[PDB]
């Protein structure tokens, strides 16, 4: 019960700290490097970032 | 590793020990904790004693052993930043060796540039011996108050200085005088007597037939049974000596401490029991406990100070400052040439080479300008500790000293609102600045010639 | 850890940027690259270096796409883009500690880059559209990134006269895609000469084009039945070709299945008809423009109208290599094509000659794309940094300290040329700073004299577009690295 | 940065509701339960000499105050937390930061003088407050339930001093067995010793005398060996000429001279280490005698009642007839020494402090009140000083505002609501406002029954606050590793 | 919450000690077998012996030994009951920490309830005469039956009572047990245990010659030194014997001389030639018992030897039974204010001899509480629930959350009848259910009985306990648990 509310609320906090500034030219970015295929994407919006990163957190499904 | 790469693996380590004592220079310094390999703890704000005893690997810091045993013994004032002052000439040479400049061209560049600034010091040189005894004694009061002692003695040095100056006047026409102190009391409660401090105890001695003397007796060999024991004691009372000193009633006197008793009393040591006579007896006012107090009515050559403080570390810091105070005052009365220190003397020599750099030009043009920038980093050390901008403050002071030829105005080590060292009565020995700024080039002669380091086996 | 994670990749990026510094200049040195297939490739440029280099750090991987843009433009001295990138990242570490935001540092580099382009326009030297005097001096000078100019005596007028005859003297685009670089074994570097027409890699003969594959009815009493039916379909094809008077046929890649039957070659041998197969489809652009050949999909649509036209076609055998030379070009085209046959003794020399000649063609394309001339030896890099150093004190602000570091990074390019030549880093630059105030702008620096001397008299000229594209691509790479504050490993 | 982690362990060592910290020694597997961190920081080893300085300065606070000696260490721990914030945010040199609190220290020292109330002449308020002293400062430990019981011991002891500043004349006796509520007050000099089985139990008008010394055939040698037994006869003969029926020796006495004392009717007392020899000589008027020949030199003691009585489990000594009120005796009783060992430090917190309080007549309201008043007075110097040290002046009051959070966290109540109501009540001009941990509210000291003597508040609340600023000048920087 | 985890682990260590002793509680308790590091096997249910050899590295568990040792100083008995009272309050303290109650509030709740429990015991006191037999056994009968030998305790019950009544005071003093010595010997049974009116010395002398078998009309002396030449030879020892015969001292008591003088063969033959009884190899701790009991003054030198320092006795003989040599002294002269007696203990195995010895020290400490306070209360855990009846009933007046911990102290009293039901082979709730209905209304002293398996009068089964047993123990047990909650953590130091 202690870690149930913690790990659920921090699901968007861990990878979302960089996208909080997305609005405005000063927004921080995030780099997603694939393990193979020589692919990657650089964006300040969490849309593509969240869908392309699998997570075991059940709160990530929402 | 050999070549230029090997020189960078050693010489560049001098910047590490320079930044360690950088914050400890002057009255603005901070207490640093040092641990010896044997387990002893040393805590002080004086950077001269910090780098004196230390365990390091690179030999670049081992050359500072001869520097610490010299500046502290010869002068003692302003010696906290002697390593930063020595590294100032090296830090400028580290940029020159990167350009490919030969070390001898760097050594001869700093050697000739330091000699040109000596003529500038002669123009601003003063003489404290030309004045009367009132001004000469007053200059000794504020000389070590604003500079030497960095611990607690900033306001209270008036008690330690007055007791030190009176000890100088009595012996004026310190190696023959033993000085120590016991933890206790306070700063203003210190006592001064004419004689040597005797910690051993046995009570009061009455005036004898002679004026102001006890006819003190000192015998090294013990009495040697009961018939001769009480017989030799009565022989001591024949001359009226109540106090007797013997190794095996004052007993167990050290070897060096026993000689200081005979020096103050102008007596002789009697090895036998047949040599006891009034001619071999010393002259001492009386011996009493107020540790026994040894007083001398007539003016003698032994005058010692008794340090008192509320902390055990104050006694070590105040006494060590007195060892350095006796060295500074000794050079002030012996050498009539004096200069105004506390940031004024270091900037004074910087403007001299700055004007001479454009006259010589040649290959030494940038070499003389580097020697000026090396002296400009010395006040930058006290600028950060006092809160002043090192680049901003010096740029203003160099502009004020350009129109007005008086160089006394400069960075204040105390941090007060008066930037004039002449107003604060800050006086440093001329030979002191010579053994610091000019003599630092001699230490650089060993560092600049470093090429290859040979490391042997076990 | 926004700063420390990004700084960890900067050290790995500056390490690669420092290693490629030895590949710049005529005094430089290249590296050996062993491919996974077992073939050895050695080149001075950073194109092959970054192509075969695999580093888990994403910053080192993004340097490949940034350098690839400059490789297609100049090809020589392209490592300076990465060297300048690694210099700005190292200088930004001290600027970041002053409290300046990374985007402000990134925006200050773009603001200083706009002034750098204007300096190149003010220092731009007038150059004529078509001349053999000016283009040869500028071609061989930019090639100094490798060892070229020794053998360039016959190579220098080749690239100058060929490109001008491909399109026109009107500049504008004049793309290099029409040039056919043919590599053959044998001969020397000086023996390389241009050909008046298109040559085949694999008397008055007509050259056709066939998109299908000649063969019996096998798309991708039984003894006489097979022989008669197969020879009947092949004979009908020979009758249609004989009526079209096409003596040279070209077939697409046959290595798959059907290939070409031997019975069809016997019927075409009596009519003296050429058969060439295993031709890449990319060669059709050279066949359609140069020879005027129209692709023929099926034999039913085969006719004379889709066939090409030529004056004299003959086979030339050079050092055992069979080459089909075409004399004369008759077609409707506004940009005739010119082919160059590269000759060399060893494959390592032939492969090095290609990149040396291809980079010599790109510098000519940079001249017809944007006209201009600049000094060589990194001399324009100092005058750009000299103006930005003075303009920083004029505008003051927070960009004054940034533009000073941006100007100091521009001095790394001329410093790299001195370090590779055995000259002291700072000692030479210190002497140059007095010479740059002497030479008065466009006066440049020579590598042989190791000092400031004339350019046009010493045959030293460089295009302005390379210096403009290098600053633009390097600025876009630095602003992207500092803008990314962290990385992630996922699918 | 070695003294920063010290404040976390001693944070629970302050306040009357604070919790004790268990100590465990690696040698002998012993244990100790105490509140004040004087013994805690001394027994626990420290790898950083920066924390060793905090231990050496705590030894002075033991005799000067002794109650909550860690109150000085927790201040420096909170100042270093705000000093590191000024090095980063404000980028101020540490020397200016340290002197920023030193310059503001003058306003804190002057705040104790302005709040000081002078009491003089009539002692009616002095003697009445002696009972109320035992209710606050005496026991901050688990013994707080004995405040009403121990009040009779501390009140009658101070009135017996009558201006006696000598602590060596006060004897502390711990009775084994019984209960803490069974501690009784006895009139006389109580010492824990014993006697012999055949020795006289009571002797009228006995004298006290101490000592610094230590007491052809196989049988043919008996003529030469009997001289050793005769050497003790010459010693007892000269002592017997003194006419003293009670003998005392520092070291142990052999059985042979022991029975020789019973033949002449002379009692023997042994097992005296330090306080047994020194205090007995001062109370009964004795002196160390190295002669034992003529009853002239030094001094001889006398006692009216030498009889031994049984107090609790082990019988102790009761000495009566002392004509000087300089010496006092406070007797306690307990089942185990766990609570008895810390009960001695309670006497050093108040009773031993009141001996030196006769010179200081100034008083100030303590128990969290005096620390908050200094934070209110220093705020007026923020706009006057200005400069770069103004940030250290405002941060100086932050360390004083975190002091009431120590008592709130140890009591379990929330420290946010209690301090918010404590500050607003004090800033309205009420100096008597203080923290109440019983009801979880803010009430005055007089309304909560917290009253102490006017001489005590200067040597405890005002002394530790003044001595703290003396000890807050220690510089803490990066040290040199061994 | 690190301090909350330390106290939680301390409760587990406290429950571990309470769960072990739980099997040894009450008269139905079970013995424990422990193997000492020295190789000696001691089997007993006494909490003082169990915790003496208990080796546990846990700091609080080591402190629990001193907690039970403190009860032995104030009382010295009831080790089958009051031992668990230490861990009883700590077992219910787990729910107190979850409610957020401050430890001082817990300490103030138990201390205030301790004073209330004393007043409840003062209401239930009964009139007990100073000299009686059956009534004084009822108070001890709870502690009289522990060891296997309790079957023969029917004869030992009046013996332990009459032993204390022999030397005692009617002024309600501390009743020091040093005057009553328990001497042991090899051979015999516990049923043959007898009491002697005079000092009995079981120490075995060297008995080299062993000429005299007994002495009639002899003066028992006390000699600290030893007779031997300093270390013509016999002439020095005969002169010492002449001084012995000068004072007519036929019995000599000498401590252990092997440190210096050792023993001489000539001195042993001279005393046997004159038929002088002597006892050697005596411990130094026996000097206090022999000096005060017989009224003899120690003598450190032969010069100090005289008649005034010597006692007297009617008949001094040595009893030989079952191979054991004991010395019985008939009659005592030079009477003083500290008379002494002796009780001869007979057993077979050395472990059995020490087994019955601890049962006697447990029984003798019972009368000490009856002489000091004549009050008497019910035993067998009956008042434990009766006290809880007067506690939880007032919980409605506690005015706030204090009522929660007020009921926990009353619920902690239910641990005593719970452990007795499990040790006697009965249901736990079935006993608690009957007690809550029985203690509700009718009379006093009623409670569960392990013998009859039901709630009835405890005095009908002759099972009671003194009032001071639970008075001092509960107050001491509630005080020790207060300091246990004062531990924030365990930190190792130098």
Which residue(s) pair with E320 in the sheet?
E325
CA distances from C87 to C288, C412, E281 (A): 48, 8, 97
Cα separation, C383 vs C121, in Å, equals 13
Integer-rounded Cα radius of gyration of chain B: 27
**Sheet containing A40-43, strands listed edge to edge, beginning at the edge strand earlier in sequence:** A40-43, A30-34, C487-490
d(CA D98, CA E443): 76
Q: How was this structure determined?
A: cryo-EM
Tally the domains of chain B. 3
Angle between helices C464-483 and C2-19 (to 10 degrees): 150
Cα–Cα dist D259/D266, whole Å: 9
Write the CATH number for D353: 3.30.260.10
Chain E nearest CA to D257, separation (Å): 8
Report chain A residues whose CB lies below 8 A from the CB of C480: 42
- Each domain of chain C, given as residue ranges in start order, spans 1-127+372-491, 128-196+336-371, 197-335
- SS3 state of residue E92: coil
Chains B and C touch (3+ CB pairs under 8 A): yes
Domain boundary among D289, D315, D341: D315
Nearest-by-CA chain B residue for C425: B99
Tell me how far apart the alpha carbons of residues E356 and D68 are, in angstroms, rounded to a whole number.
Answer: 52
Per CATH, the homologous superfamily of domain C1-127+372-491 is: GroEL-like equatorial domain (1.10.560.10)
Q: What is the number of residues in chain D?
A: 482
Residues of C in contact with B98 (CB under 8 A): 425-426
Q: Are residues B322 and B349 in the same domain?
A: no
Say if CB D16 and CB D448 are below 8 A apart.
Answer: no
Pick from D315, D347, D369: which residue ends a domain?
D315
- How many distinct helices (H) and strands (E) make up chain B? 16, 13
Q: Domain of B234?
A: 195-300
- Please tell me the distance in Å from D85's CA to the nearest CA on chain B: 17
Q: How many residues does chain E have?
A: 494
> Which of B300, B319, B350 represents a domain boundary (last residue)?
B300
**CATH code for position B322:** 3.30.260.10
C371: alpha, beta or left, given left = phi > 0 and alpha = psi -120 to 50? beta
Chains in contact with chain C (at least 3 beta-carbon pairs closer than 8 A): A, B
CA closest to B95 among chain C residues? C426
Is 3.40.50.410 the CATH classification of the domain at E198-338?
no
Which chain D residues touch B43 with a CB distance below 8 Å? Answer: 49, 53
Residue D226 backbone dihedrals phi, psi, to 5 degrees: -75, -10
Residues of D (309-328) whose Cβ lies below 8 Å from E: 310, 313
The verdict on B382 and B341 lying in the same domain is yes
Owning domain of residue D39: 1-118+361-482
Choose among D49, D93, D98: nearest Cβ to B387.
D93
C197-335 classified as CATH 3.50.7.10:
yes
User: Is beta strand E341-347 parallel, antiparallel or unpaired with respect to E180-186?
Assistant: parallel
Physical contact, E and D (3 or more Cβ pairs within 8 A): yes
Judgement on whether residues B218 and B294 belong to the same structural domain of the protein: yes
Which SS3 state, helix, strand or coil, does residue C36 take?
coil
Angle at A15 between CA A12 and CA A20, to 5 degrees: 80
Long-range contacts of A33-36 (CB under 8 A, 24+ apart): A33/C58, A33/C487, A33/C488, A33/C489, A33/C490, A34/C490, A34/C491, A35/C489, A35/C491
**CB crowding E18-28: b at 16 or more within 10 Å, else e:** beebbbbbbbb
Parallel, antiparallel, or unpaired for β B180-181 and B303-307? parallel
Residue C101 to residues A24, C87, C398, D231: CA-CA distances in angstroms? Answer: 14, 18, 11, 96
Of A25, A30, A54, the CB nearest to C488: A30
- Whether chain C has a CB inside 8 Å of the CB on A14: the answer is no
Task: Classify residue E187 by its DSSP letter.
Answer: B
Count of alpha carbons within 13 angstroms of residue C122, beta-carbon side: 11
Q: Do chains B and E touch (3 or more CB pairs under 8 A)?
A: no
Subunit partners of chain A (3 or more CB pairs within 8 A): C
The single residue of D67, D129, D146, D349 carrying the catalytic annotation is D349
Q: Find the catalytic residue in D70, D137, D246, D363.
A: D70
Which chain B residues touch D if contact means CB-CB below 8 Å? 20, 23, 28-37, 41, 43, 45, 50, 54, 384-387
Same domain for D208 and D186: no
Whether C52 and chain A come into contact, CB under 8 Å, resolves to no
Q: Which residue of A21, A22, A33 to mutate against C (max C Cβ within 10 Å)?
A: A33
Spatial separation of the C-alpha atoms in residues B146 and B156, rounded to whole Å: 11
- φ and ψ at C476, to 5 degrees? -70, -25
**CATH fourth-level superfamily of E1-128+375-494:** GroEL-like equatorial domain (1.10.560.10)
**Sole residue written with tokens 């305790």:** E153
Comparing CB atoms, the residue among D25, D142, D216 nearest residue E107 is D142
Q: Is B98 close to C426, i.e. CB distance below 8 A?
A: yes
- From the list C485, C489, C490, the residue facing A29 with the nearest CB is C485
Q: How many cross-chain Cβ pairs, B to C, lie less than 8 Å apart?
A: 9
* CA of D476 vs chain B CAs: smallest distance (Å): 7
Alpha-carbon span D463 to E64, nearest angstrom: 41
Helix orientation angle between D390-401 and D403-411, rounded to the nearest 10 degrees: 20
Beta bridge partners of D208: D246
B110 shares its domain with B216: no
Using the Cα atoms of residue E78, residue E79, residue E83 and residue E84 in order, give the sign of their dihedral.
negative
Interchain contact, C489 vs A33, CB within 8 Å: yes
State which residue of chain D sits closest to B31, comparing Cα positions.
D475
Binding partners of E (≥3 Cβ pairs within 8 A): D
* Cα–Cα distances in angstroms (integers) from residue D3 to residues B57, D41, D46, D196, E4, in the given order: 29, 11, 10, 54, 26
User: Does the beta carbon of E492 lie under 8 angstroms from any beta carbon of chain D?
Assistant: yes
For residue C306, give Cα distances in angstroms to C210, C212, C277, C292.
10, 14, 18, 8
* Residue C458 CB coordination number (10 Å): 18
Please give, rounded to a whole number of angstroms, the shortest distance from the CA of D112 to a CA of chain B. 23
Distance between CA atoms of residues E42 and E53, nearest Å: 9
Q: Measured between CB atoms, which of D43, D177, D256 is closest to E301?
A: D256
Hey, is the C-beta of E489 within 8 angstroms of any chain D C-beta? yes
Looking at the structure of chain D, the number of domains it has is: 3
* D63 is a catalytic site residue: no
C430 in contact with B, Cβ within 8 Å: yes
State whether residue A12 sits within 8 Å of chain C by CB: no
Resolution of the PDB structure in angstroms: 6.8
Which among C48, C90, C35, C21 is positioned nearest to C478, based on CA atoms?
Answer: C90
> Do chains A and D touch by CB distance (3+ pairs < 8 Å)?
no
Mind telling me the catalytic residues of C? 45, 78-79, 359
CB contact under 8 A, D217 and E489: no
**Dihedral in degrees, nearest 10, Cα atoms B165, B169, B171, B174:** 20
Residue with tokens 């019981």: D149
From the list A18, A35, A40, the residue facing C485 with the nearest CB is A18
Residue E343, C-beta contacts closer than 8 angstroms, at least 6 positions apart: E159, E163, E180, E181, E182, E183, E193, E194, E195, E196, E360
Q: Please report the beta strands in B36-188, taking only residues with DSSP state E, as ranges in sequence order.
A: 41-44, 126-127, 180-181
Question: Looking at chain C, how many residues does it have?
Answer: 491
Partners of D433 in beta bridges: D444
Interface size between D and E, measured as CB pairs under 8 A = 136
Question: Strands (DSSP E) along E361-400, which ranges?
Answer: 376-378
| DSSP string for C151-181 | THHHHHHHHHHHHHHHS-SS-S---STT-EE
Contact present, C264 and C296 (Cβ < 8 Å): no
Q: Which of B1, B50, B59, B55 is nearest to B22 (CA)?
A: B50
Query: Is the four-CA dihedral D415, D416, D422, D426 of positive or negative sign?
Result: positive
What is d(CA B446, CA B453) in angstroms, rounded to the nearest whole number?
A: 13
| Opening angle at CA C401, ends C396 and C404, nearest 5 | 105
Residue of chain C with shortest Cα separation from A53: C490
The runs of H, that is alpha helices, within E189-339 are 233-246, 265-273, 287-294
Torsion, Cα E152 E425 E71 E12, to 10 degrees, reads 150
Give the residues across from B250 on adjacent strands.
B245
Q: Of B255, B282, B300, at which residue does a domain stop?
A: B300
How far from D373 is each of B457, D82, D110, CA to CA, in Å?
68, 20, 11
Boundary residue ending a domain (D325, D344, D360): D360
Cβ <8 Å between C489 and A53: no
CA distances for E405 relative to B301, E70, E86, E97, E417, angstroms: 83, 26, 17, 11, 20
From chain C, the residues in CB contact with B99 under 8 A are 424, 426-427, 430
CA distance E405 to E399: 12
Known catalytic residues of E are 46, 79-80, 362
**Strand D170-176, strand E41-44: pairing:** unpaired
SS3 percent helix, strand, coil of chain C, rounded to 5, is 50, 15, 35
| Pair (D188, D333) in one structural domain | yes
Could you say which of B311, B336, B361 is where a domain stops? B336
Task: Name which of C61, C480, C489 is nearest A35 (Cβ-Cβ).
Answer: C489
| CA D466 – CA E440 distance, rounded (Å) | 63
Written as six digits, the tokens of C348 are 């390592």
Q: Do D201 and D170 reside in the same domain of the chain?
A: no
| CB nearest D222 (choices: E59, E224, E229) | E229
Which secondary-structure segment (H or E) carries B374?
Answer: helix B364-386
Q: What is the largest CA-CA distance in chain A?
A: 42
How long a stretch of residues is chain A? 62
Are D164 and D325 in contact, with CB atoms under 8 Å apart? yes
Any idea which residue has 């001084």 for tokens?
E243
The answer to whether D343 and D332 are in contact (CB under 8 A) is yes
A contacts of C61 (beta carbons < 8 Å)? 38, 40
Is residue B417 classed exposed, middle or buried when 0-12, 13-18 and 19+ CB atoms within 10 A define those classes?
exposed
Q: Which residues, other chains included, contact B258 with Cβ-Cβ below 8 Å and sequence gap of 6+?
A: B218, B245, B269
Q: How many of the other CB atoms lie within 10 Å of CB of D388?
A: 16
Indicate the DSSP class of residue C310. Answer: -
């Amino acid at each position: 019960a202690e870690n149930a509310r913690l790990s659920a609320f921090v699901g968007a906090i861990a990878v979302g700290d960089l996208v909080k500034s997305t609005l405005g030219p000063k927004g921080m970015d995030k780099l997603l490097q694939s393990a193979s295929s020589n692919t990657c994407m650089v964006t300040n919006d969490g849309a593509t970032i969240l869908k392309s990163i699998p997570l075991d957190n059940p709160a990530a499904k929402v | 590793q050999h070549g230029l790469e090997a020189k960078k693996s050693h010489i560049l380590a001098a910047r590490s020990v320079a930044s360690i004592i950088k914050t400890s220079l002057g009255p603005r310094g901070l207490d640093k904790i040092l641990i010896s390999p044997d387990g002893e703890i040393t805590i002080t704000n004086d950077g001269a004693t910090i780098l004196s005893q230390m365990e390091l690997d690179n030999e670049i810091a081992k050359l500072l052993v001869q520097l610490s045993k010299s500046q502290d013994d010869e002068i003692g004032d302003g010696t906290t930043g002697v390593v930063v002052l020595a590294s100032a000439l090296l830090d400028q040479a580290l940029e020159l060796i990167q350009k490919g400049i030969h070390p001898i061209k760097i050594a001869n560049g700093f050697d000739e540039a330091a000699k040109l600034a000596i003529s500038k010091l002669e123009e601003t040189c003063d003489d404290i011996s030309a004045s009367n005894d009132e001004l000469f004694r007053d200059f000794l009061l504020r000389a070590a108050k604003t500079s030497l002692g960095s611990k607690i003695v900033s306001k209270d040095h008036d008690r330690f200085a007055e007791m030190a100056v009176e000890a100088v006047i009595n012996v004026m026409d310190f190696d023959l005088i033993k000085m120590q102190g016991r933890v206790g009391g306070s700063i203003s409660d210190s006592k001064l007597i004419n004689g040597v401090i005797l910690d051993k105890d046995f009570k009061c001695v009455l005036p004898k037939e002679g004026s102001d003397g006890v006819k003190l007796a000192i015998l090294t060999c013990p009495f040697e049974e009961q018939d001769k024991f009480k017989e030799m004691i009565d022989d001591v009372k024949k001359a009226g000596a109540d106090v007797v000193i013997c190794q095996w009633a004052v007993r167990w006197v050290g070897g060096q401490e026993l000689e200081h008793i005979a020096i103050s009393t102008n007596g002789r040591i009697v090895p036998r029991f047949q040599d006891l006579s009034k001619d071999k007896l010393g002259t001492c006012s009386r011996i009493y406990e107020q540790m026994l107090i040894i007083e001398q009515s007539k003016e003698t050559k032994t005058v010692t100070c008794f340090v008192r403080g509320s902390n055990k570390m104050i006694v070590d810091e105040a006494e060590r400052a007195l060892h350095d105070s006796l060295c500074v005052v000794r050079n002030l009365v012996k050498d009539s040439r004096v200069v105004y220190g506390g940031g004024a003397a270091e900037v004074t020599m910087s403007l001299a080479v700055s004007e001479e750099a454009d006259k010589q030009r040649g290959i030494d043009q940038y070499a003389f300008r580097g020697f000026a920038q090396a002296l400009d980093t010395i006040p930058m050390t006290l600028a950060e500790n006092s809160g002043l901008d090192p680049i901003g403050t010096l740029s203003t002071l160099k502009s004020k000293q350009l129109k007005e030829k008086i160089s006394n105005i400069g960075v204040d080590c105390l941090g007060y609102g008066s930037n004039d060292m002449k107003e604060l009565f800050v006086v440093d020995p001329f030979i002191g600045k010579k053994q610091q700024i000019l003599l630092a080039t001699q230490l650089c002669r060993m560092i600049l010639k470093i090429d290859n380091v040979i490391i042997s086996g076990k | 850890k926004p700063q420390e994670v990004r700084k960890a990749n900067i050290i790995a990026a500056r390490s690669v940027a420092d290693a490629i510094r030895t590949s710049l200049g005529p005094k430089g040195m290249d590296k050996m690259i062993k491919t996974s297939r077992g073939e050895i490739i050695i080149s001075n440029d950073g194109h092959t270096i970054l192509k075969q280099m695999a580093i888990l750090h994403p910053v080192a991987r993004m340097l490949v796409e940034v350098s690839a843009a400059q490789d297609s433009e100049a090809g020589d001295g392209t490592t300076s883009v990465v060297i300048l990138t690694g210099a700005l990242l190292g200088a930004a570490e001290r600027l970041l500690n002053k409290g300046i935001h990374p985007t402000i540092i990134a925006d200050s580099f773009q603001s200083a880059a706009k002034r750098s382009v204007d300096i190149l326009l003010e220092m731009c030297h007038k150059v004529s559209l078509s001349d053999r005097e000016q283009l040869v001096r500028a071609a061989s000078t930019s090639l100094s990134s490798k060892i070229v100019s020794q053998y360039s005596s016959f190579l220098a007028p080749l690239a100058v006269d060929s490109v001008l005859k491909i399109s026109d003297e009107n500049s504008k685009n004049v793309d290099l895609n029409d040039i056919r670089l043919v590599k053959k074994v044998g001969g020397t570097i000086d023996d390389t000469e241009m050909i008046d027409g298109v040559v085949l890699t694999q008397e008055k003969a007509k050259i056709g084009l066939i998109q299908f594959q000649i063969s019996p009815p096998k798309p991708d009493r039984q003894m006489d039945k097979i022989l008669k039916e197969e020879r009947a379909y092949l004979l009908n094809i020979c009758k249609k070709i004989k009526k079209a008077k096409c003596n040279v046929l070209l077939i697409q890649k046959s290595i798959l299945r059907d290939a070409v039957n031997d019975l069809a070659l016997h019927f075409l041998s009596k009519l003296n008809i050429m058969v060439v197969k295993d031709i890449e489809r990319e060669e059709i652009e050279f066949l359609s423009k140069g020879l005027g050949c129209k692709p023929i999909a099926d034999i039913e649509l085969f006719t004379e109208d889709r066939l090409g036209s030529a004056d004299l076609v003959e086979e030339i055998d050079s050092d055992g290599s069979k080459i089909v030379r075409v004399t004369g070009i008759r077609n409707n085209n506004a940009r005739p094509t010119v082919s160059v046959v590269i000759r060399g003794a060893n494959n390592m020399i032939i492969d090095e000659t290609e990149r040396s000649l291809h980079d010599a063609l790109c510098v000519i394309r940079c001249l017809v794309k944007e006209r201009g001339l600049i000094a060589g030896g990194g001399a324009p890099e100092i005058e750009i940094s000299r103006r930005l150093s003075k303009e920083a004190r004029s505008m003051e602000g927070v960009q004054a300290f940034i533009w000073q570091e941006f100007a100091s990074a521009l001095e790394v390019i001329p410093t790299t040329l001195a370090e590779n030549a055995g000259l002291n880093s700072i000692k030479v630059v210190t002497e140059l700073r007095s010479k740059h105030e002497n030479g008065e702008l466009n006066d440049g620096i020579s590598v042989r004299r190791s000092g400031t001397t004339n350019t046009y008299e010493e045959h030293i000229l460089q295009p302005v577009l390379v210096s403009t594209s290098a600053i633009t691509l390097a600025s876009e790479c630095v602003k992207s690295i500092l803008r990314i504050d962290d990385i992630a490993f996922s699918r | 940065v070695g003294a920063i982690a010290v404040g976390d362990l001693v944070k629970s060592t302050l306040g009357p509701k604070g919790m004790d910290k268990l100590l465990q020694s690696a040698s002998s597997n012993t244990c100790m339960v105490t509140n004040d961190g004087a013994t805690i920081l001394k027994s626990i080893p420290l790898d950083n000499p920066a924390a060793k300085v905090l231990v050496n300065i705590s030894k002075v606070q033991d005799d000067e105050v002794g109650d909550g000696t860690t109150s000085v260490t927790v201040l420096s721990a909170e100042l270093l937390r705000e000093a590191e914030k000024l090095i980063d945010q404000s980028k101020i040199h540490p020397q200016t930061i340290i002197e920023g609190y030193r310059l503001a220290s003058a306003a804190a020292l002057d705040a104790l003088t302005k709040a000081a109330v002078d009491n003089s002449h009539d002692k009616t308020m002095f003697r009445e407050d002696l009972i109320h002293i035992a209710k606050t400062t005496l026991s901050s430990k688990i013994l707080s339930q004995d405040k009403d019981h121990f009040a009779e011991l501390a009140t009658n002891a101070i009135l017996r001093l009558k201006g006696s500043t000598n602590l060596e004349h006060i004897q502390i006796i711990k009775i084994l067995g019984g209960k803490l509520s069974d501690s009784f007050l006895d009139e006389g000099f109580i010492l824990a010793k014993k006697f012999g089985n055949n020795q006289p139990k009571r002797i009228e008008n006995a004298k006290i005398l101490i000592a610094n010394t230590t007491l052809d055939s196989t049988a043919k040698l008996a003529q030469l060996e009997k001289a050793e037994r005769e050497k003790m006869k010459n010693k007892i003969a000269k002592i017997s000429k003194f006419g003293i029926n009670t003998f005392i020796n520092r070291q142990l006495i052999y059985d042979y001279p022991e029975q020789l004392f019973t033949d002449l009717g002379i009692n023997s007392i042994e097992h005296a280490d330090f306080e047994g020899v020194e205090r007995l000589a001062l109370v009964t008027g004795g002196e160390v005698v190295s002669t034992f020949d003529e009853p002239s030199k030094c001094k001889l003691g006398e006692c009216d009642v030498i009889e031994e009585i049984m107090l609790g489990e082990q019988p102790f000594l009761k000495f009566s007839g002392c004509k000087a009120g300089e010496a006092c005796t406070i007797v306690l009783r307990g089942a185990t020494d766990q609570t008895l060992d810390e009960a001695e430090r309670s006497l050093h917190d108040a009773l031993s402090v009141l001996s030196q309080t006769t010179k200081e007549t100034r008083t100030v309201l303590g128990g969290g009140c005096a620390e908050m008043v200094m934070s209110k007075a220093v705020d007026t110097e923020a706009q006057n000083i200005d400069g770069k040290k103004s940030l250290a002046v405002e941060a100086f009051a932050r360390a004083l505002r975190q002091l009431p959070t120590i008592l709130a966290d140890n009591a379990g109540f929330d420290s946010s609501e209690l301090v918010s109501k404590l500050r607003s009540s004090i800033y309205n001009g009420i100096s008597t406002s203080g923290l109440d941990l019983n009801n979880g509210t803010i009430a005055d000291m007089r309304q909560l029954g917290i009253v102490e003597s006017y001489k005590l508040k200067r040597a405890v609340v005002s002394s530790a606050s003044e001595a703290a600023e003396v000890l807050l000048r220690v510089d803490n920087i990066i040290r040199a590793r061994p």
